[PDB]
Paper text:
Complex I couples the transfer of two electrons from NADH to ubiquinone (Q) with the translocation of four protons across the membrane. The L-shaped complex is structured into a peripheral arm that protrudes into the aqueous milieu and catalyzes electron transfer with one FMN and 8–10 iron–sulfur ([Fe–S]) clusters, and a membrane arm embedded in the lipid bilayer that mediates proton translocation. We have determined structures of the electron-input module of complex I from the hyperthermophilic bacterium Aquifex aeolicus, encompassing subunits NuoE and NuoF that contain the FMN cofactor, the [4Fe–4S] cluster N3, and the [2Fe–2S] cluster N1a, respectively, both in the air-oxidized and dithionite-reduced states at resolutions up to 1.8 Å. Here, we show that the redox state of N1a regulates NADH oxidation in complex I by inducing a conformational change close to the NADH-binding site.
However, when bound to the reduced enzyme, the NAD+ nicotinamide adopts a position closer to the tight position because the carbonyl group favors the position facing cluster N1a. This allows the nicotinamide to occupy the tight position although this is a non-productive state of the enzyme/substrate complex.
Numbering used by the authors:
A (entry chain A): 6 to 160
B (entry chain B): 2 to 418
Write the structure that this text describes.
């Protein structure tokens, strides 16, 4: 297994950013999930070598941090906040609208590998509840018609 | 130039300090910052001794804005008594339910934050500084990297900053879904490239932090006060609000209010004023049932007249205000707090590991009417026994708010029995 030069340069860039190589593990993994749309299991060994860390170390880290999914491949990850404020302001109406539009519930992926619903804890935008992200982009849920237009921007 | 989409959180100030620019929901770059006298506190600080700066921050009475309210000048004093190299860290992890105050400084006035970091670094003699930002703030991440490059380009970062001989590099690190990484020792472990597991304290980071070296960890909002302390002097900074809890304070207000957002007010303000005078009162003019101070406290409608300060009878915490009205079920609300803790325990401590899981598992059964008399009795017991043997503040508080609701609203709880 070999990372394409598109990703390999970016990884080295992160690895050479901090004073010590090992500190770039979270930045490297974020870049791996952005490129593949998940954490491929095969990508762990080359990364462990680049970070000069044992494999067990890297595996433990991927397991520890929730922003990483080594199971399903999705082009777009709809992070839906399920915490106190969003619950109080209509998380159920956001999830119901998502289910009507894409046919999927939290934890599921669409058949085309395009969209995955990820239930997350407080996203720190509680004044804009119900909050959801679509990869890096963050929005306040207003209605199914509003949501529909947002999702349509993801090709 | 093009950052990820971020919601336009409403911001309002009576002081025009931390929100002077961040009251506008957009990135204020270096030229716009410099135009408002930006980086001039840095210039003044580089001419002063690092010790003078520590003394000014001590005398200003600035206390930590990351929830525990420890005196900042004092924290800096502790670190400087142990030899260098020293490390300065900006806690930008902000994962507390209802807390979204730090992100508006980052995203809208990054240079206010950068400036504070440089003065703070010079003060403790840290030549290497870190911003640990949560992974769910990617826009803030890119806004900070870009702004750091702008400051390096204008000679505020690098070797021999403005001919003072002081060297500084600020590195920006990203979290990845772990609330516990906001706890300073877990944050340090995560900076080292490891799992976000809190270390046993003492030692405190000021003695043994990053790479076992003296390390100062401060919250975004705390650091943002440092350019103001230097610019106006500690005396004039102490003029803002009451003399015992002085300076500006950001209050993130959400839930059942007409005007949800971040409010910059003095700490003499009452919780009642925050809700009705500033956040425009309750949505639909319904009566306030309770107020959740993040995932920490619960204040009934009988406790709205308390100050928003660090006093024992005060609101405290990060000044996070989640307003609940009469139609909101407190048991349904308490379940969401239980679920948070269950999802965030690092599992190092057995009573925290099992207690956080069980409280949420049993409270869910209570709510869904699946609860036996033993699940009810067990729920009460587990809620009182998450704290034993815990090495970090998470295990200590996991049952705090939920215990409060039981004591303050017994009627709503008894209906589920
Ligand atoms: N802002 C947010 O997003 C957020 C999120 C979660 C939690 N929190 C807050 O975190 C708080 C709990 O934090 P904590 O456990 O770090 O609190 P703490 O009381 O143990 O310590 C606070 C700070 O004081 C320093 N300190 C304390 N005693 C010291 C000593 N004797 N010598 C040197 N340094 C010393 C610590 O190094 C730390 O930086 C809660 O009140 C909560 O509100 C904030
Ligand atoms: C579980 C837990 C999570 C925390 N998360 C944060 C956080 O997101 N941001 C923060 O600044 N402090 C957080 N803290 C508090 C830090 O441990 C630390 O006290 C603070 O960053 C120090 O900065 P201050 O003195 O300027 O307030 C957390 C504490 C605990 C126990
Ligand atoms: S109290 Fe809980 S969150 Fe804190 S160190 Fe122990 S197991 Fe981890
Ligand atoms: S509770 Fe959902 S963003 Fe805070």
């Amino acid at each position: 297994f070999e990372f394409p030069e598109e990703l390999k340069t970016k990884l080295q860039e992160h690895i050479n950013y901090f004073p010590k190589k090992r500190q770039a593990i979270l930045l490297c993994l974020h870049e791996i999930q952005n490129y593949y749309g998940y954490i491929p299991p095969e990508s762990l060994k080359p990364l462990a070598d680049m970070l000069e860390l044992p494999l067990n170390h890297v595996e433990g880290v991927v397991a520890f941090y929730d922003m990483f999914d080594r199971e399903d491949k999705a082009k777009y990850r709809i992070r839906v906040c399920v915490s106190i404020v969003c619950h109080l302001m209509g998380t159920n109406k956001l999830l119901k609208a998502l289910e009507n539009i894409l046919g999927i519930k939290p934890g599921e992926v669409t058949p085309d590998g395009k969209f995955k619903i990820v239930p997350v804890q407080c996203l720190g935008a509680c004044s804009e509840a119900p909050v959801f992200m679509v990869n890096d982009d963050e929005y306040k849920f207003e209605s199914e018609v509003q949501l529909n237009e947002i999702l349509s921007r993801y090709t | 130039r093009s950052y990820p989409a971020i919601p336009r959180i409403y911001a309002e100030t009576t002081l025009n300090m931390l929100l002077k620019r961040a009251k506008k929901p957009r990135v204020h770059s270096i030229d716009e910052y410099l135009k408002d006298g930006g980086y001039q506190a840095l210039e003044k600080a580089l001419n002063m001794s690092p010790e003078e700066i520590i003394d000014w921050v001590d005398k200003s009475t600035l206390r930590g804005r990351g929830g525990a309210g420890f005196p900042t000048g004092k924290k800096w004093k502790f670190a400087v008594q142990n030899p260098g190299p020293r490390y300065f860290i900006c806690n930008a992890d902000e994962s507390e339910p209802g807390t979204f105050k730090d992100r508006i400084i980052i995203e809208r006035d990054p240079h206010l934050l950068i400036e504070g970091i440089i003065i703070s670094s010079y003060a403790i003699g840290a030549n290497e500084a870190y911003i640990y930002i949560r992974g769910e703030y990617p826009a803030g991440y890119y806004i900070l990297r870009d702004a750091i490059e702008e400051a390096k380009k204008k000679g505020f970062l690098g070797k021999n900053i403005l001919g003072s001989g002081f060297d500084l590099e600020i590195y920006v690190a990203r979290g990845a879904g772990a609330y516990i990484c906001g706890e300073e020792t877990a944050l340090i472990e995560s900076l080292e490239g490891k799992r976000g597991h809190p270390r046993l304290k003492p030692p405190y980071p000021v003695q043994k932090g990053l790479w076992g070296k003296p390390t100062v960890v401060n919250n975004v909002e705390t650091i943002a006060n440092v350019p103001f302390i230097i610019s106006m002097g500690w005396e004039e900074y102490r003029y803002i609000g009451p003399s015992d809890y002085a300076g500006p304070k950001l209050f993130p207000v959400s839930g059942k209010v007409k005007k949800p957002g971040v409010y910059e007010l003095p700490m003499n303000t009452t919780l009642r004023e925050v809700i009705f005078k500033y956040a425009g009162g309750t949505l639909g003019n319904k009566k306030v049932k309770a107020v959740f101070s993040g995932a920490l406290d619960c204040f009934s409608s009988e406790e709205l007249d308390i100050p928003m300060d660090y006093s024992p009878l005060g609101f405290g915490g990060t000044g996070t205000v989640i307003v609940l009205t009469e139609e909101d079920d407190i048991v349904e609300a308490a379940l969401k707090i239980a679920e948070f803790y269950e999802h965030e325990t690092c599992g190092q401590c057995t009573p925290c590991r099992v207690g956080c899981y069980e409280q949420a598992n049993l409270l869910e059964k209570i709510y869904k009417g699946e609860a036996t008399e033993q699940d009810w009795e067990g729920f009460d017991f587990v809620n009182r026994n998450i704290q034993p043997t815990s090495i970090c503040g998470l295990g200590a508080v996991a049952g705090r708010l939920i215990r409060q609701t039981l004591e303050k609203f017994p009627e709503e709880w008894e209906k589920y029995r």
